[PDB]
Amino acid sequence: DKKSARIRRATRARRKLQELGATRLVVHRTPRHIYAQVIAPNGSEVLVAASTVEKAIAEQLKYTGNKDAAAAVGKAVAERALEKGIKDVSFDRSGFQYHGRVQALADAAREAGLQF
Amino acid sequence: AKLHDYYKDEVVKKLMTEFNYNSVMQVPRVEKITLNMGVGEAIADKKLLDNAAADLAAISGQKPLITKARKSVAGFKIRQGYPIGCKVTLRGERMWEFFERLITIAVPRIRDFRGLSAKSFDGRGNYSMGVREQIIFPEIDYDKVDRVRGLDITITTTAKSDEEGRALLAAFDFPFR
Amino acid sequence: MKKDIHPKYEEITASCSCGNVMKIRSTVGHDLNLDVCSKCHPF
Amino acid sequence: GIREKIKLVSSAGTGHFYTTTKNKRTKPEKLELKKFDPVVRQHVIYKEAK
Amino acid sequence: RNGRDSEAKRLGVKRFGGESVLAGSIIVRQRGTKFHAGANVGCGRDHTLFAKADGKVKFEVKGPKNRKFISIEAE
Amino acid sequence: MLQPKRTKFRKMHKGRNRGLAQGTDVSFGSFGLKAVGRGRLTARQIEAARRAMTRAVKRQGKIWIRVFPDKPITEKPLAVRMGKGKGNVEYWVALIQPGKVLYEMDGVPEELAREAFKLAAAKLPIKTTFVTKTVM
RNA sequence: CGACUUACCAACCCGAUGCAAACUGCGAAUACCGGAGAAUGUUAUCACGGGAGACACACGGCGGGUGCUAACGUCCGUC
RNA sequence: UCCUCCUAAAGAGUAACGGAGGAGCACGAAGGUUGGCUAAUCCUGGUCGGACAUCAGGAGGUUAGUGCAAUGGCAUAAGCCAGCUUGACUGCGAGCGUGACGGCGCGAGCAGGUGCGAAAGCAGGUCAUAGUGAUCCGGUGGUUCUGAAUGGAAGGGCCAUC
RNA sequence: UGCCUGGCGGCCGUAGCGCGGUGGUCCCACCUGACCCCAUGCCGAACUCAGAAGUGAAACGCCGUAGCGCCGAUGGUAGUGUGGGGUCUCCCCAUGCGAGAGUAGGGAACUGCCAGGCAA
């Protein structure tokens, strides 16, 4: 199962970040509408979220679910986090290879202020 | 690829009408084919493995991989991690052209032909069979090879049972004698 | 698809004795001559 | 105890050396690990010797 | 042909639930991991559990496998 | 001569016979022999009792044995000093607690059943009583 | 190349019955460790210093190994 | 002498010429990190091939495996595969466990300089528990520390090691 | 506020399996192609990129069903600390603690944060 394999892949990282006790930037990727979220160390609340599923961010990019979409979401999370106040975060692959859209989102985020 | 268009042209409709499914994807469809060659005699002479792999590359469109023994058994004098066979799995588009070569030029050239078997089903919808000699495929000139070893074929589809798998194969004008 | 590890997969036209001609991509080589095919055979 | 002990001598002029073990029957070639030399406080190549 | 034995390794729980410990103190000595490290608890190379912070030690059961965990709360 | 096959260990500790019997009810036949006393039965005693009943019933009905030795017992050879290791295994015994059902039987009249069990109990070292299958 | 029966041998499983110091999908009483509290006890506690003796133990109860669930036998745990 | 289980009486420890077995290693990778993967046993179809080679599907969920006997542990895998590598590093070390002692074990963290990863991070050998021998005497390399009138040297000391 | 959907958790079998039904407005999945990014110890299988035709088949979510797993009393029983007694290799009395298995029964979940669509 794709989901079961993915959860098994990301379990070690999630546990490592959980015991470390640090805010983590978690990204969920699908064939469309790449998501992104910021989670408190306790893991119970979401500091801020962004994605291409809402019209506020989906009204510019031609198509959601590409490199451009990842950069927009990656950038979008940036100023939101900077405005909120949190600066340092830990990136979570969530079992997605850090190659394409995931890398583009992270690259946009780190260059936008969320260094990690 | 030509039969893939043929499959997409009316065979899907033929499957649709006969089983009157609710949807279109319910019809069984082939996803991959697998070629096996359990040589077994690697112990006597491991050098022949390379050429045994070579001919499979002649029939197939890609390089085979050599499989290793799952475990060591004293009854066969084989140790764990020792190559004792090769296989090939082909899917996507290349499977279709190979399926042509099997169904058009290979089956007719069977020595002492009697008819393709129809009871060779695993019980879930997957078909398997074997061949005596390589010359059935055109890629053997009878002078560059001097071995009688055969090979095994196996086509797997998304059928939930044998009845639709047999019906789907029948749509491909299989002998089934 | 890996490079420079697979045999050449060029197209080639093959015809049999009963007048049926078809194009197939394989590793047969330069030319091919057949006598029977799917049809025109006592199967 | 076929495994026997060797000495790894730093490529630098310093006389510092490490001591380890190896099997000459299986791996007869020399050992060229890159280790830390505290006399010069740098990582340098260490060569096998008696 | 018997008569051989090994010196006892004095394993077991060294600090029990609800008693304060200093950082670096050994809590449990074990061969495997009968208890898994929790919060402010580190695991040694020999699966020894030691306190990484000063506080009260507590035991609990967590996870889908109901495996036992040792934590420390700064109290 | 009941005896296990390829037991895990040749020797085992003496242990104790405290406690109370578990198989205290008739489960297979219609009549049974219940153990009143506490002790151990050797394999030879079980065989002797079994032969006594089979002859008594004249191979009519069914016989069930509800006890197995599965416990080796050692014994030092004569003129051997104490020590020098555990003794060699000699015979196998079954520990019996009060209420244990030793033998069960079915397919014979109650009258003939009583004498058959009485003959068997005469060749056992523990007080026994006759019981009948109960309804639930 | 189809295929069939069985008065006869029997695997794996299902239902019932047991056994285990070196079996545990369960699990006490006590004991042990830590914290708070009252009373009681000639500080009964700990650390340091001076001086020792002792390191052949025995029986009884309880939990055992060994022996024959023999020994005023032998070897351990606790009083 | 050392290691594992039981005896051992639910903390630790606990004897017998009591009941069972092992060790005097191995590995420059079988170590470090990054990425990925998940067995045994059965059922059906299939050339040699046959109960037991390899292929496909299904039940199964770890009865597999874990370099070496046993116990405990291991899916975040400690199990299996591949890339890059030498942290199997130097000086320390709060605080603990264990011993009559000699001693043995665990260890966050700090400084220096490294490897893997985009990064958070991990790495002071190996899933852990056996694979080991005090002191004396002497050998090898470094270090003006000393060097018995002075300058050297011999010989000692210190450090690494046999 | 409600029916829904996705992510991150709490909690961990009353939460897990089996059978039947139900879902495409969004979301999710399958799905087309892959010259380029990326990968196959062979394979667009898996991973990754460019897409959205088609579809709810499979998977996933929800509902129903006890057919299993699971939870589970009260009472009794076993064992047991302390103090006594006996026909003492085992038991009994006073007091304290009190199982395991089984039985009646329960049971096919609950809950926090964020984001999106519909109706409000």
Coordinates of C-alpha atoms (C1' of nucleotides) in Angstrom, one line a residue, chain H:
Chain H
rU1 C1' 39.2 -18.0 34.4
rC2 C1' 35.0 -15.8 31.4
rC3 C1' 29.6 -15.9 29.1
rU4 C1' 23.7 -17.5 28.9
rC5 C1' 19.3 -20.1 31.3
rC6 C1' 17.3 -22.8 35.6
rU7 C1' 17.9 -23.9 40.7
rA8 C1' 17.0 -18.4 43.1
rA9 C1' 11.5 -18.4 47.1
rA10 C1' 7.9 -11.7 41.4
rG11 C1' 14.2 -5.5 43.7
rA12 C1' 19.7 -6.9 44.0
rG13 C1' 22.5 -11.0 45.6
rU14 C1' 22.5 -16.3 46.9
rA15 C1' 25.5 -22.7 47.7
rA16 C1' 26.3 -28.0 46.1
rC17 C1' 31.4 -33.3 42.6
rG18 C1' 23.0 -29.7 41.3
rG19 C1' 20.4 -29.6 35.9
rA20 C1' 21.7 -27.7 30.5
rG21 C1' 25.0 -25.2 26.9
rG22 C1' 29.1 -21.9 25.1
rA23 C1' 34.1 -18.5 24.8
rG24 C1' 40.1 -17.8 24.6
rC25 C1' 37.1 -14.9 18.2
rA26 C1' 35.8 -12.5 13.9
rC27 C1' 35.2 -7.8 10.8
rG28 C1' 38.7 -2.0 7.2
rA29 C1' 34.2 -4.3 6.6
rA30 C1' 30.2 -7.4 9.1
rG31 C1' 32.0 0.1 11.4
rG32 C1' 29.7 5.6 10.5
rU33 C1' 25.9 8.2 7.9
rU34 C1' 22.1 8.8 3.9
rG35 C1' 18.4 6.5 0.8
rG36 C1' 15.3 2.3 0.0
rC37 C1' 13.2 -2.7 1.2
rU38 C1' 10.4 -6.3 4.7
rA39 C1' 10.3 -12.7 6.3
rA40 C1' 9.2 -18.4 7.8
rU41 C1' 5.6 -21.9 6.4
rC42 C1' 1.6 -23.3 3.3
rC43 C1' -2.3 -23.3 -1.3
rU44 C1' -2.9 -22.9 -7.0
rG45 C1' -0.6 -22.6 -12.3
rG46 C1' 4.0 -23.4 -14.9
rU47 C1' 10.2 -27.4 -19.2
rC48 C1' 13.7 -30.2 -17.6
rG49 C1' 12.1 -29.7 -11.9
rG50 C1' 11.3 -34.3 -8.6
rA51 C1' 8.3 -33.4 -1.3
rC52 C1' 12.1 -29.6 -1.3
rA53 C1' 16.0 -24.7 -7.0
rU54 C1' 13.7 -20.2 -9.9
rC55 C1' 8.6 -17.3 -11.8
rA56 C1' 3.2 -15.4 -10.9
rG57 C1' -0.8 -14.9 -7.5
rG58 C1' -3.2 -15.9 -2.6
rA59 C1' -3.6 -17.0 3.1
rG60 C1' -0.1 -15.6 6.8
rG61 C1' 1.8 -11.5 10.1
rU62 C1' 7.7 -12.5 12.0
rU63 C1' 6.6 -19.4 13.6
rA64 C1' 12.1 -15.8 9.6
rG65 C1' 16.5 -13.3 10.3
rU66 C1' 19.9 -11.0 13.6
rG67 C1' 28.7 -13.8 11.9
rC68 C1' 29.2 -17.8 16.9
rA69 C1' 25.7 -20.9 22.8
rA70 C1' 21.7 -19.1 25.4
rU71 C1' 18.5 -15.3 27.4
rG72 C1' 16.4 -10.4 26.7
rG73 C1' 15.5 -7.2 22.7
rC74 C1' 14.6 -5.8 17.6
rA75 C1' 9.1 -2.7 12.3
rU76 C1' 11.2 4.0 13.8
rA77 C1' 13.6 -2.1 12.5
rA78 C1' 19.0 -3.7 15.9
rG79 C1' 16.9 -7.7 9.9
rC80 C1' 18.0 -7.0 4.0
rC81 C1' 20.2 -3.8 -0.3
rA82 C1' 23.0 0.5 -2.4
rG83 C1' 25.8 5.5 -2.6
rC84 C1' 29.5 8.4 0.0
rU85 C1' 32.9 7.6 3.8
rU86 C1' 36.8 6.6 8.4
rG87 C1' 33.7 9.2 14.8
rA88 C1' 37.1 2.0 15.3
rC89 C1' 39.3 10.5 16.3
rU90 C1' 42.4 13.6 20.3
rG91 C1' 42.0 16.2 25.1
rC92 C1' 38.3 15.9 28.8
rG93 C1' 33.9 14.9 31.4
rA94 C1' 28.8 16.8 35.2
rG95 C1' 26.4 12.5 37.3
rC96 C1' 25.6 7.4 38.2
rG97 C1' 25.8 1.6 38.4
rU98 C1' 29.1 -2.3 40.3
rG99 C1' 32.7 -4.3 43.4
rA100 C1' 36.6 -5.6 50.3
rC101 C1' 40.1 -3.7 47.1
rG102 C1' 42.9 -3.9 42.5
rG103 C1' 39.3 -2.7 39.1
rC104 C1' 35.0 -2.9 35.6
rG105 C1' 30.6 -0.5 33.2
rC106 C1' 27.1 3.6 31.4
rG107 C1' 27.3 8.7 30.2
rA108 C1' 24.9 14.1 28.8
rG109 C1' 28.0 18.1 27.8
rC110 C1' 32.7 21.4 26.5
rA111 C1' 37.2 22.4 23.1
rG112 C1' 39.9 21.0 18.6
rG113 C1' 39.5 18.8 13.9
rU114 C1' 36.5 15.2 10.5
rG115 C1' 32.4 11.9 7.7
rC116 C1' 27.3 11.4 5.8
rG117 C1' 22.6 14.7 4.7
rA118 C1' 19.2 20.2 1.6
rA119 C1' 18.5 20.2 6.7
rA120 C1' 17.0 19.0 11.7
rG121 C1' 20.6 15.7 13.1
rC122 C1' 23.7 11.1 13.8
rA123 C1' 28.8 9.1 14.5
rG124 C1' 34.1 8.6 20.8
rG125 C1' 33.3 0.8 16.8
rU126 C1' 29.9 -3.7 16.0
rC127 C1' 21.5 -5.4 19.0
rA128 C1' 23.5 -6.1 24.2
rU129 C1' 25.6 -9.6 27.5
rA130 C1' 32.0 -14.2 26.7
rG131 C1' 36.7 -13.4 22.9
rU132 C1' 40.8 -12.3 28.5
rG133 C1' 46.2 -11.7 32.5
rA134 C1' 48.1 -7.5 37.7
rU135 C1' 53.2 -6.2 39.0
rC136 C1' 58.4 -6.9 38.0
rC137 C1' 62.1 -7.1 34.2
rG138 C1' 63.3 -5.8 29.2
rG139 C1' 62.5 -4.1 23.7
rU140 C1' 60.8 -0.1 19.9
rG141 C1' 59.4 5.5 18.6
rG142 C1' 58.7 10.5 20.5
rU143 C1' 59.8 14.2 24.3
rU144 C1' 66.7 18.8 26.9
rC145 C1' 61.8 16.5 32.1
rU146 C1' 66.3 14.8 34.5
rG147 C1' 71.2 13.8 33.6
rA148 C1' 75.4 13.4 40.4
rA149 C1' 82.6 19.4 38.7
rU150 C1' 81.1 21.8 33.8
rG151 C1' 79.3 20.9 28.1
rG152 C1' 77.5 16.4 26.2
rA153 C1' 76.3 11.4 26.4
rA154 C1' 74.9 6.8 29.0
rG155 C1' 71.0 5.6 32.2
rG156 C1' 66.3 7.0 34.3
rG157 C1' 61.3 9.7 34.1
rC158 C1' 56.8 11.1 31.1
rC159 C1' 53.8 9.7 26.5
rA160 C1' 52.5 5.8 22.7
rU161 C1' 53.3 0.6 22.2
rC162 C1' 55.4 -4.7 22.3

